[model samples]
Target: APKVGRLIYTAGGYFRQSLSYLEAYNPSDGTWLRLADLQVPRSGLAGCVVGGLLYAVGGRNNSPDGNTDSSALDCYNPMTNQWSPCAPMSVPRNRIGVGVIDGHIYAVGGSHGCIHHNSVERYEPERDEWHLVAPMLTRRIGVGVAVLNRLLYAVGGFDGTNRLNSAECYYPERNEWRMITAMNTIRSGAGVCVLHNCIYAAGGYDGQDQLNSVERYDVETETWTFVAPMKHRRSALGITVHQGRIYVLGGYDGHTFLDSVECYDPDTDTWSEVTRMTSGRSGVGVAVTMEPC
Candidate 1:
């Protein structure tokens, strides 16, 4: 293991519905700490670290027949132990794809109710403003997004009509997106992160069953290859690289929520269960601080 500064995970219905709970984990001691609550409770949120602050965005408090999207952006300050409001988006997005590239937080496609989106937005931390970026070719919800080598990769997600295996890449300089090779499996709400110079897409739900399968994409080859499967099926889980390994937290296994966490070591090409979470959580957001938090 390497020196991982600090890791914090937040939001996701802790048990029954949307929650405001935020918790931090220290691998050095393998312990958990309950932190400040999110000002607004939500689920299906996405997060990233920028300018020493953790930004949480695009979640909802909707039910089967209702829609209540969370429109405001929130930033958490570790030193102050508080969460504060930021600029809101043009539209509310739930189950959105998120990535950080060139120090800008990019909010990708998500849904409102029955409406899936192709629109994308980027936030400038210095300006504290969010502006529109070039939209993707397809509308998506619960997309798996990651940034590797300065390029933003958006993978398998539900495109309203179907669960997708298709993937694409975005160039910040050009404000455009290019289609990439499809994944071996359909994955929306999969845990995705960059490791070993490749993008890893973890367990997610296809249109049918919960998935425990994983895949690694080689950007140079523009291809996706199957990797080791996780021990438990997961979708809408929390995932981030810590101590040079990928740690995935709780997610829905279709029938019930998971409380288990696992780590994937690419050096060994294996995944093993780590510690369990405080409670079952699906659609949790994870952010890793490079410096002390």
Candidate 2:
């Protein structure tokens, strides 16, 4: 069998309205390959890789009447190169948070219609079922969810009345959620990921403006501190860690949809321009996986 480095797959964002676009970027050769399209078009859909499969969670498809939420859950089999609809969520949702631990995938806070949600749900892949888990401490939409040391952290997003700076982590053993120290700034739709011992939150809308600032949380100290900022102010971007580096994908800068992408080195606390995607996307979901060559 031949082996390649890894593939970073990204799909459906608000910028990709009416199009269920999907693409995979191979960092090994600095090349990209378009994959099977999503079953439905949406934005702010949450995505994660568990058990070698990619799961695209609830997101909204826009319409003239405004936006319509999707409770639809879609899964992709890289081997077959096809997408299939899995058991849908109980309620329509967009901007939902997701975390995978111990082969169990979790869907956290997101909005339902005009109401923000503190609700959480657990998806059992084997049985193809979704059941409500213990809810979060606060309602959030566009929240950033990441897993660190077996703990699932739910970070900044909007709670209807306010853009949030608060965060919480879910304990699967107890089926409970606990509050953590707040970030230095309020952020909604921030791109986030766990790297090494820390969780990094970057580029989100801060109520008034699109944010370029970045901050990191130390699990041990339960503290957040400002870090290196990106060259572009991005909101609702796709972010993930691969090859020991953080990659921030397409997002909006308030003025325009941005196709620019940047890479970060935590060791040196610096960010640099990288290969840009074909089209700009906001509310995009990104996940890392290895593909057979």
Candidate 3:
């Protein structure tokens, strides 16, 4: 993790969102701040930090139509508080998972309207090009991705027919994927993040209902363990870490999208309320603001 700062930037999914900006939040004091508005509005995309910048790629612009998948790559510079386009991806896709490794951005499985896909691609800003990488072992849509100990882990996503509990790790050095333990529940559109080598999968819907179930993945043992559940069941929640604690943002509960935010502390097994987002949303993207390194 980038240790220069600790600020919560987003808590709502910004469902049906178009202007793709990374919002910032300060959990300690409970405040919401808008950093930069995206040139184009999009939703259902994953966000991650690499080096000192923020990156967002592959999300739906409108509805779940085939034309929704976007190949655009956007990066935000915190120092300038600005957003600019980067190299485009090899394929147009949305509802995808993204990660950062060795200064490159990796986009994982997602849907293209017609069907779920298993393709993987890496973007290099220095070279201004995109390279195809080894695809996930299973096709995924609306997957959650995180980086732990240099390995990229993809967890709890839909595979077209049904939600998936299966998880895997991709090692860029070997360009190969290895199976890991499945999650406790089959879920997609859940919020996932890695802290202390433990992957947290929280809040998503199964075919029949929404969930508040929260689980943790231990990389050393390759297994998932249950933890304190969220107060509400949801899908498309924005999960992020701010100030040494994990924060769960807005998502669609069984009935409606939310603007509420909660912070979870593993040591205490407690949940605390954070500030409400300026807008209620689902399928939101998040990023922590940092001073330029």
Which candidate number would show the highest TM-score if scored against the true structure?
2
Q: Which scores higher on lDDT, 1 or 3?
A: 1
lDDT of 1 by residue, 1-293 (tens): 35456665555553577878888777777788888888867888897898778888988975555558977789988888888999998899999879998788899999998989899999988898999999998888999899998999888889998998888999988988999988999998899899868899999989889899999899998788888899999898988987679999999998888989899888898999878888888988888874334
TM-score for each model: 0.95, 0.96, 0.92
lDDT of 1 at 81: 81
TM-score, cand. 3: 0.92
Summarize candidate 2's per-residue lDDT along 62-100 as a digit string, tens digits.
856577888988988888888988998888878887889
**Candidate 3 lDDT tens digits, 1-293:** 44645565542245554445567765545565676777777777767676667777877776444236678888777778888888888877777888777878889988887778888998887887899999889998889888888899888788988898889999988999988988879888888888787998988877888888899899888789988989878888888877667888888887777877888998898777766777778877766657432
| lDDT of each candidate versus the true structure | 0.85, 0.87, 0.78
- Order of quality (TM-score): 2, 1, 3
lDDT of 2: 0.87
The list of candidate 3 runs beyond 4 A from truth reads 1-5, 11-21, 63-67, 291-293
| C-alpha-based local distance difference test score of model 1 | 0.85
Consecutive 10-residue window with the lowest summed lDDT within model 3: 10-19
Model 1: ten consecutive residues of lowest lDDT: 6-15
